[PDB]
Scaffold this active site. Structure first.
Site, PDB file in Angstrom:
ATOM      1  N   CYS A 432     -26.467  25.193   4.111  1.00 40.75           N
ATOM      2  CA  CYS A 432     -27.819  25.301   3.570  1.00 40.75           C
ATOM      3  C   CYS A 432     -28.930  25.336   4.615  1.00 40.75           C
ATOM      4  O   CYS A 432     -29.715  26.282   4.656  1.00 40.75           O
ATOM      5  CB  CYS A 432     -28.091  24.143   2.613  1.00 40.75           C
ATOM      6  SG  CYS A 432     -27.105  24.163   1.097  1.00 40.75           S
ATOM      7  N   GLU A 434     -28.339  23.348   7.980  1.00 41.41           N
ATOM      8  CA  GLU A 434     -27.844  22.626   9.156  1.00 41.41           C
ATOM      9  C   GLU A 434     -27.653  23.475  10.427  1.00 41.41           C
ATOM     10  O   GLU A 434     -26.769  24.328  10.497  1.00 41.41           O
ATOM     11  CB  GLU A 434     -26.531  21.920   8.775  1.00 41.41           C
ATOM     12  CG  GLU A 434     -26.595  21.195   7.401  1.00 41.41           C
ATOM     13  CD  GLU A 434     -25.919  21.970   6.258  1.00 41.41           C
ATOM     14  OE1 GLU A 434     -24.668  22.035   6.238  1.00 41.41           O
ATOM     15  OE2 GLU A 434     -26.627  22.515   5.377  1.00 41.41           O
TER      16      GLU A 434
END
Lengths: 786, 786
Positions: A432, A434
């Site tokens: 998402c 990171e």
């Protein structure tokens, strides 16, 4: 200017239809094969068992070439389906066998034959999974803390790890033969009488067996292709199938030369990773950077064909699926794989790296219009205006793409965590939001979700919950005379649960290393071959662990309400608030109104914005205290996938005026309907949080009425909005741009909106595949105008 | 003056008869129980599976109290029998099930019921033993070297490790409760968020579970004793059983106070070690040092009863047995357990430590006259004359006891290996002749047997054997012009095989740590609890690995014959010798005579003695190059158990005149019939070897005609013989003193000589239990007179 997008070939429309018309199911071939292999390798070290199992799977798993495909390699017979990975966990599957097809969203089909064949699988793996060993390593106190509805470490507990971007560029250059040769060379350098080389030897030979199996796998498709070609009347398609057979035969072991070869080899690398393990967030990362050289040096390929090949890859990324237990499915709704692919940004010397493939990736998103891949773009001080504007054009399409990431905050944050400046500059995104240096990291980027709102509830109730003392017995709220005493209790509750979440993660970490070290994946990440050890055993150059905090806006709004309404203005006593919350505001709507009218996060009001910041920092500072078995540091993130709805259902009424069971806020975005001062003010509020310490990433969602993106001014305004947020040190931002009427129509007549895509949180999804609870949370989000 | 020995009570005669009249068999209870447990702990870490398995075994294994016993605790229902340890290996047992009772020596009985019950045991453990994992860790080249008839690493491959003397003194003082409390204290000191403490926590809790199981086991005997007492009419015996019930109830957790309590607790410690694992050479070591305090402080016990209790311990040590496979049984003939118990010597201050118990141990050997324990005595510059003469009196009894060890060489040798002077001075012997500091060492004192004579055979044949190149292709013997070239080739062959032997040992070392770490044994050896790691994982203060060289005299005699007959005098060419040896001297007895007449080791002839020294040193220097997975160094030994006969059967004719298939020499003793210059000359020759480098111990056997020890002069002469050898730096010496007519008569009418004991090599055995090949080798040994 807005040039608009080109039209994709009919082939793409046909392949896309295969994905959407598919009926997601659970297949048993892989499960049967790994079980058969393990039964024959009991006396072998874990690493060799894993290599021999991958070999047995790759040599016998069904192969499939779908009609009209240019890029081949399918993990399941039925498109968009899932294999089973019993080595991690399987008892949950055994329990849900008969109700998988009865789910609303994320439904999976499964044949009676498969149910029957899985019986032996469940029997063999009893007590032999990573999940079972992980629990055995946990202390009784940790087990209790894990089951207190405060946090969840289910992700790596029930399934594989993943969350990595391998060195795709290296394998594309040297091929599977190149990796094998590097392993063999290291084996020669390691010749020694030192006992420490015994285990390294087994690891290196496991890498060789694994890569040799990959070569075999690719050759099976080469043979399959010719076989189909010889049975094809159409001259055009027959020529296509023969070309596929030719390409597969070459890249079976050699590196790529032409663009078509690079595209096909890329997919085989990606696909096989997904066969060895089912950890998700297997992210292509900087696709435009490692694929461009092959496109540029290909002097025969036309842009139209290069674009069609990229479109095919986009479609293939939508072919992979993963079945999860019913609870975990609430955390990851919408058949998500989270394969993040990012374009643009700067190179190692700090110069812009935009290229032709960067733009073709943006084009592909419009050609295919499917949930995957999770397309993203990097933005920095010198991003070309035309690039940002093109990204804005894509956002206007309403697919929720692309996600925007800030180089100016991310690079410094990464260097702060130990990466060299050169490596930090070459970051890509995992899952998402990171960040990581691809090909050199084992980041465990989504090791857990932590409910920040529950900590507020436990502070008010002194660690007492459901007639049981689950947390520390902190000072009774009724006896507190200052907000300082409140924050101290808040910190004490946070400390206790963060400690057990990190300890639980470490036990799962040890379990994966002991029972599921991965030979194939490890061979493509730096130092593993050189160190002679797997990713699970710390072979990566960079090591981290990343747990997520959920409920930031709820904490800021709750903390400022407690401070103002209770301690500063003395409108109500601590006792009164405690009783009101425990009764869910029953017969005390006047008190709830007082709470709802307190200052809310997302309106550029410092009083509350700074408490959202401090509230989140308490969580972040606790996470930073821990280290993992791989010698790496834990780093906090603030994103929720789709768990904010589920976490909300497990959380009682909170001081911000939110009623029991209601969804929590998503990522670092303001709570629904709370941001009433415009999107710029909202951005200003979010930018006040510490986005540097939350180096595992923070997620910011904004939703616009379609009129806001209309015309060139619309694109200019979005561009200005993004730049201002990033100049203020924001980490990430993404936008939904859709007509609310369309979402409501989709709920009433799903059949009529099969191709409707929507942004959830860090990923997009087919709206009708989502559970109604998640659909409603998205519809309820604040809708802005510029 | 010859004091003579006292007479043992009738009880001792009765108990002794139970041992000799027993019919050694294989029982299945333990195997069934450990199998039950492992099936229920699949998801547990190895260390906990081991602790839970021990718990299950101790709570359910049959308990037996034999008639007239004062000290209770029986590992098997039938005396002198063995349980099965499938966790190490078991397929060999499955193969020999129907021929165990068809053996001549070392025969074992087994019921059809046990055979039936073991079927499931064999099925479950397939591929899950330490032996199978060990093979998996070995490279193909190592596997081949292991099967070339040059060396064997079977000891720790097929069964447990053992070879240790635990801290008996500590447990007698604090009891099992004390050990549990120490583990609990460490657990508290280890409270931390560091991931490294997770595995340590599991180890410490495994120690606790194991020790709690020990307490349960003891309490079972306490209850049983009382139950038998209630059905006993005889007042005297009833009182005896009630006292036993009283003692067991106390030492079931608490430390001992009285001598009776110390004796019973001691046996429980020793017994339980033998239930957890079947590694042999579990050695009491300095029994006189840790038992004397309890005897001296016991103000009520009479010397006669104290002696009877010690006599009971002696008999219990003969109750334990261990079944081994057909081949390994040739390596350890005579139902041996090798439990070495030593008395005398100096303390850590360098002062003499002889005490009353030292003498009671010597007395017990004469009262019981059984093979165990392997009684030994330490001798140093200040040994009391009375003590040495008493040891001499025992030797005259003809039991082969006691073995004599030289402090003057052993202490310096140990300090050279890393022990502090204090620890070295407190050494005890393990198994046959292996020294160690008790309670602080994991020495792997018998990790392998290496056939030195085969290296000479392979030098002459350039590594070619049985029409296959098994060793390095060294210079063709036929082309050699100097003895230096021969020695160079000899070293090259030695280097290759020693390398693979040590590597094979390390693979077995890793396998034991991975699948059989021992919680109970580890709790009684230093630093394990403090480090939070098992013995298998390097927890001991001192770590070593010890492989044995066999055939010292054969190498010396062979090397000097090659040097003199071939290169110095040129009596024959290299080719002629090579051909005659390969033909086993057929039609060339004139050449064999030349070799037999060359100088022989054991006659104080420097020319050959120095080559025996150099020949052995080549082996020792190779062994010293290696380290084990526990961070310890390998140290060589020179002893053979009973394998010199088996090794001899696998060795062709050698340059010393020995014919193919004949036994090799035992330890560092001269070859049979070669020492024709008297025992003193023999001792002088043996003392020329480097006994300091062979710190894992060297073994020297001498046999005397009974007339040689007659009267006071006989004792004085034996005493002078020993001191002279030790003054010259000899390591160890032991003596057989028996009429050859008795041995021959025992072969013809075994039932007439059931109580006849004879010294083999580092241990004594019931003569009639030995295979004829071993009996004949002993009978053929040189017989001396003073």
């Amino acid at each position: 200017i807005s040039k608009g997008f080109s039209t994709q070939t009919e082939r793409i429309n046909i392949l896309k239809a295969q994905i959407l018309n598919a009926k997601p199911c659970v297949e048993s071939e892989r499960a049967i094969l790994i079980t058969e292999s393990f039964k024959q390798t009991e006396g072998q070290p874990a690493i060799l068992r894993r290599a021999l199992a991958l070999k047995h799977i790759l040599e016998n798993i069904p192969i499939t070439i779908r009609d009209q495909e240019l890029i081949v390699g399918s993990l399941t017979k039925e498109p968009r389906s899932s294999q089973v990975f019993p080595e991690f966990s399987n008892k949950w599957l055994q329990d849900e066998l008969d109700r998988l097809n009865k789910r609303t969203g994320d439904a999976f089909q499964i044949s009676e034959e498969s149910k029957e064949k899985l019986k032996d699988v469940f029997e063999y793996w009893n007590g032999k999974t990573t999940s079972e060993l992980a629990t055995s390593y946990m202390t009784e106190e940790t087990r209790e803390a894990v089951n207190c509805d405060v946090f969840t470490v289910g992700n790596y507990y029930y399934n594989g790890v993943g969350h990595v971007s391998v060195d795709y560029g290296k394998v594309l250059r040297v091929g599977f033969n190149g990796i094998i040769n590097e392993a063999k060379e290291q084996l020669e350098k390691n010749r020694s009488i030192d006992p420490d080389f015994i285990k390294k030897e087994k690891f290196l030979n496991s890498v060789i067996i694994s890569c040799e199996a990959a070569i075999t796998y690719v050759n099976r498709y080469a043979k399959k292709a010719k076989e189909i070609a010889d049975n094809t009347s159409d001259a055009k398609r027959k020529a296509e199938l023969n070309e596929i057979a030719k390409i597969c035969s070459k890249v079976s072991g050699e590196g790529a030369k032409s663009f078509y070869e690079a595209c096909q080899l890329f997919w085989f690398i990606h696909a096989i990773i997904n066969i060895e393990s089912n950890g998700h967030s297997i992210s292509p990362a900087r696709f435009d950077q490692y694929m461009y050289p092959y496109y540029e040096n290909d002097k025969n390929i036309t842009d139209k064909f290069a674009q069609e090949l990229i479109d095919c890859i986009w479609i293939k990324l939508n072919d992979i699926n993963k079945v999860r237990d019913e609870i975990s499915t609430k955390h990851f709704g919408g058949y998500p794989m989270y394969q993040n692919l990012i374009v643009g940004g700067q190179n190692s010397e700090g110069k812009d790296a935009t290229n032709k493939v960067s733009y073709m990736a943006l084009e592909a998103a419009v050609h295919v219009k499917l949930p995957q891949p999770s397309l993203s773009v990097r933005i920095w001080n010198k991003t070309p205006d035309e690039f940002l504007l093109r990204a804005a054009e894509l956002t206007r399409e309403g697919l929720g793409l692309p996600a925007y990431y800030n180089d100016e905050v991310i690079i410094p944050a990464l260097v702060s965590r130990g990466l060299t400046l050169e490596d930090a500059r070459d970051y890509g995104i995992i899952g998402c939001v990171e960040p990581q240096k691809p090909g050199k990291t084992e980041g465990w980027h989504d090791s857990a979700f932590f409910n920040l709102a529950r900590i507020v509830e436990l502070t008010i109730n002194s660690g007492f919950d459901k007639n049981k003392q689950i947390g520390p017995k902190t000072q009774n709220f009724e006896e507190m005379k200052s907000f300082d005493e409140f924050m101290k209790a808040y910190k004490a509750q946070m400390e206790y649960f963060v400690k057990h979440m990190c300890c639980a993660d470490n036990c799962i970490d040890i379990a994966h290393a002991e029972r599921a070290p991965l030979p194939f994946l490890s061979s493509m990440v730096d130092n593993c071959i050189g160190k002679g050890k797997s990713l699970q055993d710390g072979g990566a150059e960079y090591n981290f662990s990343g747990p997520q905090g959920v409920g930031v806006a709820n904490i800021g709004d709750s903390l400022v309400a407690v401070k103002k309404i209770v301690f500063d203005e003395n409108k109500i006593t601590p006792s009164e608030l405690k009783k009101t919350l425990n009764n869910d505001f029953k017969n005390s709507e006047e008190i709830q109104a007082l709470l709802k009218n307190a200052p809310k996060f997302g309106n550029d009001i410092d009083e509350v914005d700074n408490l959202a910041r401090e509230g989140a920092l308490v969580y972040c500072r606790e996470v930073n205290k821990y280290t993992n078995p791989r010698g790496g540091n834990f780093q906090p993130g603030l994103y929720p996938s789709s768990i904010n709805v589920y976490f909300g259902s497990l959380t009682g009424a909170t001081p911000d005026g939110r009623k029991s069971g209601q969804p929590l806020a998503d990522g670092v975005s303001p709570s629904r309907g709370c941001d009433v001062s415009g999107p710029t003010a909202a951005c200003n509020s979010v930018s006040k949080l510490d986005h540097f310490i939350a180096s595992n990433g923070t997620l910011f969602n904004q939703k616009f009425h379609p009129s806001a993106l209309k015309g060139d001014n619309g694109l200019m305004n979005l561009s200005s909005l993004i730049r201002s947020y990033f100049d203020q040190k924001g980490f990430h931002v993404q936008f939904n741009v859709i007509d609310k009427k369309i979402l409501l129509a989709a709920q009433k007549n799903p059949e009529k909106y099969q191709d409707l895509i929507v942004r959830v949180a860090g990923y997009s999804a087919q709206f009708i595949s989502l559970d109604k609870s998640i659909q409603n949370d998205i519809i309820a989000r604040t809708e802005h105008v510029m």
